[PDB]
Amino acid sequence: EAPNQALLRILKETEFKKIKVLGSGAFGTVYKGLWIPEGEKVKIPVAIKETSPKANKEILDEAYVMASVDNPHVCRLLGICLTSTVQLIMQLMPFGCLLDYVREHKDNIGSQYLLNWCVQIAKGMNYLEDRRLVHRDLAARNVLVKTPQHVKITDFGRAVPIKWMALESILHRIYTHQSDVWSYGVTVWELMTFGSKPYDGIPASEISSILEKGERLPQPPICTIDVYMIMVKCWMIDADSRPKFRELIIEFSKMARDPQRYLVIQGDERMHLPSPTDSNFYDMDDVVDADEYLIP
Ligand SMILES: COC1CCN(c2nccc(Nc3cc4[nH]c(-c5cn[nH]c5)cc4cn3)n2)CC1
């Protein structure tokens, strides 16, 4: 098929400055930083993710997939630094992941924000389908928040989360774009429940039998039958019966026009989250967001 003419940028260690640590886990550590290219007179806020040969291959594969994407609703790789450890330099998503965001801000999250997020993920996911790319790990934890009004899909480690997986993926290890639709349904559930753990208390081994019986995630209280019907269609046994991402864009977009008709949240409209129209929302001299920094 079509040759992958993507450019992999090798960035110098001296070109960027690791401000602090955002979080550490099993993978290693993710830092907050600033990338100052050559003599460009720009400071780009970045996320730096940093020896065994096997771990280097895994991180280099994520870099390959990440450099091979370009969509406003997908995280792009800004470059890699070939140090003793090796690290992926990516766009800083200041508000962290959407799963933690909905949990920490439920009292200010309105129907407009929720439906708009659903559109943005369906759009990001429809892009990956265009680029013939199966995500295999879509969840609210793998959707990052640039601004409360702008989210992006991330984590291209896969290109096992049983509670996010389709039945074919659990039983036969089949991963299709329609298997991502199931994970999308679960992601939407995560958001509408403001961060609830799907199938809470139920062990992962029981999930397979539960779905086979016909059991599915409950109707979130804020959800109308219109929204829950979409979530249900995403969880069909027949993958071809599930909606396409191009249809999920259309469906959530229609709804996002009149949000209060499709999501019932007490105190809606009066609620507000930070915006570029806020006081001190963002040296702050010559700081540009990655989305505005492009080399020819
Ligand atoms: C799992 O442990 C922690 C990792 C860092 N977390 C965080 N806190 C604040 C901002 C932020 N921004 C951020 C995070 C990012 N993570 C990735 C990434 C995707 N795949 N691999 C790394 C890109 C990216 C951009 N901004 N992240 C908190 C949880």
Got the DSSP string for 177-193? HHHHHHHHHHHHHHHHT
Q: Where does the chain show beta strands of DSSP type E?
A: 16-24, 29-35, 44-49, 77-81, 87-91, 143-147, 150-153
Could you tell me the distance, in angstroms and rounded to a whole number, from the CA of residue 89 to the centre of ligand 1? 11
Nearest CA owner, ligand 1 atom 8: 96
CATH 3.30.200.20 boundaries in the chain = 1-92
* Cβ of residue 136 lying under 6 Å from some atom of ligand 1: no
Contact assessment for residue 47 and residue 22, using Cβ atoms and an 8 Å cutoff: yes
Rounded distance between C-alpha atoms, residue 190 and residue 164, angstroms: 10
Q: How far apart are CA 147 and CA 141, in angstroms?
A: 16
CA distance 87 to 68: 17
Q: Outline which parts of the chain fall under CATH 1.10.510.10.
A: 93-280
Q: How far is the CA of 27 from the centre of ligand 1 (A)?
A: 12
* Amino acid residing at 53: P
Which protein residue has the closest C-alpha to ligand 1 atom 11?
A: 96
Find out if CATH 1.10.3720.10 is the number for domain 93-280: no
Count of Cβ atoms closer than 10 Å to residue 51 Cβ:
8
| Cα(76)–Cα(64) distance, integer angstroms | 11
Please state, in angstroms and rounded to a whole number, the distance separating the CA atoms of residues 203 and 85.
36
Nearest to 187 by CA among 166, 157, 160: 166
Q: CB-based contacts of 71: which residues, under 8 Å, 6+ apart? A: 123, 124, 127
Would you say the CB of residue 49 lies under 6 angstroms from ligand 1?
Answer: yes
Residue 151: C-alpha distances to residues 28, 95, 121 (Å): 24, 10, 8
Q: In units of Å, what resolution does this entry have?
A: 3.1
Q: Which H or E element spans position 111? A: helix 111-130
Catalytic residue among 137, 155, 240, 291: 137
Q: Which of 21, 27, 30 to mutate to test the pocket of ligand 1 (most atoms within 8 A of CB)?
A: 30
User: 């989250």: which residue's tokens?
Assistant: 273
CATH number of this structure's domain 1-92: 3.30.200.20
Q: Residues near 209 by Cβ (< 8 Å), separated by ≥ 6?
A: none
- Helix 177-192 to helix 225-233 angle, to the nearest 10 degrees? 150
Concerning whether 268 is annotated as a catalytic residue, the answer is no
Find out whether the beta carbon of 153 lies less than 6 Å from any atom of ligand 1. no
CA distance 157 to 243: 25
Q: Whose CA is nearest to atom 2 of ligand 1?
A: 23
Cα of 294 vs centre of ligand 1, distance in Å, is 22
Among 208, 210, 138, smallest CA distance to 170 is for 208
Residue whose C-alpha is closest to residue 153's, from 178, 117, 100 = 117
How many angstroms is it from 201 CA to the middle of ligand 1? 27
Residues 6 or more apart whose CB falls under 8 angstroms from that of 120 comprise 73, 150, 151, 152
How many angstroms separate the alpha carbon of residue 30 from the centre of ligand 1?
Answer: 6
Q: Which of 107, 122, 141, 124 is nearest to 181 (CA)?
A: 122
Does any ligand 1 atom lie closer than 6 A to the CB of residue 154?
yes
Sequence-distant (≥ 6) Cβ neighbours of residue 137 within 8 angstroms: 155, 157, 158, 161, 164, 183
Contact criterion met (CB below 8 Å) for 187 and 143:
yes
Kindly give the distance from the C-alpha atom of residue 147 to the centroid of ligand 1, in angstroms, as a whole number: 14
Neighbours of 271 (CB within 10 A): 16
CB neighbours (10 Å) of residue 235? 18
How many CB atoms lie under 10 A from the CB of residue 45?
18
Bridge partners (DSSP) of residue 97 are: 144
Q: Is the CB of 195 under 6 A from ligand 1?
A: no
- Polymer length in residues for the chain: 296
The bridge status of strand 16-24 relative to strand 44-49 is unpaired
128 in Cβ contact with 135 (< 8 Å): yes
Method: X-ray
DSSP label at 219?
A: -
**CB of 167 sitting under 6 A from ligand 1:** no
Q: Is 137 in the pocket of ligand 1 (CB under 6 A)?
A: no
Cβ–Cβ under 8 Å, residues 198 and 147: no
| Spatial CA neighbour of 115 closest among 252, 233, 250 | 252
Q: CA 85, CA 71: separation in Å to the nearest integer?
A: 29
Sign, CA torsion 139/144/150/152 = negative
Q: Is the CB of 42 under 6 A from ligand 1?
A: no
Q: How far is CA 171 from CA 166, 184, 209, in A?
A: 9, 19, 10
14 vs 34: CA distance, rounded Å = 11
